[PDB]
Amino acid sequence: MTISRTQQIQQLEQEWTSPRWKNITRPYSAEDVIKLRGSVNPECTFAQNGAKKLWELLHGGSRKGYINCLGALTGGQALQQAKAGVEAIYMSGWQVAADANTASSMYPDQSLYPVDSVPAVVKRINNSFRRADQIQWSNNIEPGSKGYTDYFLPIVADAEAGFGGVLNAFELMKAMIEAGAAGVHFEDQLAAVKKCGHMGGKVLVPTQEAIQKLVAARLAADVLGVPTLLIARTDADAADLLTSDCDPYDREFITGDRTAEGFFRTRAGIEQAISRGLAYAPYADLVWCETSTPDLALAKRFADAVHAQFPGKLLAYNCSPSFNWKKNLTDQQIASFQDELSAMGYKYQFITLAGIHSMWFNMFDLAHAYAQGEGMKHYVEKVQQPEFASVDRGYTFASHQQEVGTGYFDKVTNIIQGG
Template identity: 60%
Template structure:
């Protein structure tokens, strides 16, 4: 027996005028097949957006060929492959799609998109409250203090592969809660509470993919399911992966990393999400290679091999450019991991990429692994990101900002508390009060985590509830 096929479609006006609704996205449903109500024809159907799962293979191929979103991008698979892999159930990944579309808009309309590394939901909430428009989630920070093993690890892919998606989900949950709290407060104050978009897009670290192309495919799917907007992939050997600022890095052949990028794009296409795929190369410093199979890598071979069987290669600018050019057709942004804040290297790399791929967007790690004042003076530091932006570095981020902010602030509080007792904590509290003038709200910590929101849930269920939490609290009495 043939059964109707239910296909979810989004309203074409969902993001009309650039406005992006908060929270869940409404869709309409079209039912096709025997017994379905007649439609007024294709003209009445909503126009497809990038990644729309309702498209046929022919429609998908046409969109790849004509939509500016996919200009200059290459896929080593067909639209028929994508449709065949989608299955019969269309799962809508609202947060991932919304984030990807937002991030794509930002990197094409903002001078540059600035992000700080967060590894907790609250850190992300404070970043958005302070005005940042994107969130970065580094594998380094997840390894150090947010992985599902509950261990402290160096940045060597030692933690479970689903740890980063779990933190993506946690951050999105925190942002959704902040939105719910503020929306409820706005309703109670007749619109006096400021309206903001809490769902900042998250760019997440997939490291070297935790295996081969199938692992990368599954990891990308998990990132999308968790709501990541963009994901970056580095060209190291996953089993020997190191932080980009450590030694002992082993590259995979250029062709192998292209397969990883291709797998990530395939996962996004199957999921129906126009995810941002970022290619990172560590070829500036890495001097080991797993195989000499790729002709593009052969000019950099030294002829030596290690006891593990790796090939020694000459790292440096030429290797970086060769890999950047190879990855450009398979990625939305390219990131070169560098050892110091070097504007000249950034400029020459951008020029080399743009000579063959005009307008290609680039990413830059403003790393805490750089001793910034050892290389630049105050004026150079102040203008550094603006100069990068002029070269095409559209996404600029500080990978380990959360780790250093938490570590130093807690150390200073603990040191002061050890020396001066309550005076040290009161200094922190007074600093919080002062920051309220700039929009800070966590001084009222009960409100910050949703106590008032759940009081609103309680009154919806029982308007005469006598067990509300915030009314009668010390926060209500003492914090105004």
């Protein structure tokens, strides 16, 4: 049955009454969304599937009661995470800046790479998943059977602050969805003006401007018709600078001091972060207070404050890869950290830079020994034997040709050529 424009509007209005959209504010109409959709709205299968799966995982479907992730910067890394039992992929903008962007360059984390970069790697990941799934399906290995992997993990992707204005955010959100992201995060700092020096640091935008970026992102998702998870990050815990005092909501944090650039000094900390989290909560599915120092007490303060106004709100938490865990916490505290966060409502947790540290450290570790001599000894000891020892854990890449689809394409060849 053909679906008329009026029917599209009605169906959208109906969808917004479903449990998925409970407590979510949209400052525009269904009619407005359909006005932007065009007469043909190409389907985004990976994004639809990812968003639905991520929602399920966030609400009781996960194995541990929370989702824990590790930043992946190649499709193959993501694939190994799936094989290993990880339930969702974290896609880090920092890692993409460093070693996987479309400028083919190494950058620090300041929104320097071209805006198509993160969507490009999301696509890479979904293609690795797709080939792995094709291999599995071609051998009729089914869910519940030994050796089965559900390869299509939802991908949560870093959109920075949207690379400019509301339209840049709108376009980037669409690109994430088209690439197949399940969730996307936006933050309220402006990387472009990050202040250099000892009295520098991150700079926030007014709350109203951060809210408008979230509205732009939700609009993009609504126009495409995909219930993508939207995560609002605040940098207000550490950021003691603000571009403009134009939003009265921010006034209580302004100290009066200005920078040479004209920025306003603010009182950074948990209170400012709470202010931002409360403001963003109606416009996002999850709220995230960026933290450089893992601290359960502060995590509890943030969660309690948000939940006092927004009971049950889903929260995200980044677990620092640079914080010296052993030096600052007991082994018991380290082992229980993510569990403890989960009980507070942090249901999406991640180590942003895990993949790049994993890759870079282990490349170094092998290379340093190998370069000195007895090369094969070191390859065998550091790589080949440990691989063999992981077969019982579900590692399959010792069988390298099948892993990348040699058997799959042999089947294709055979089907083409007959027999």
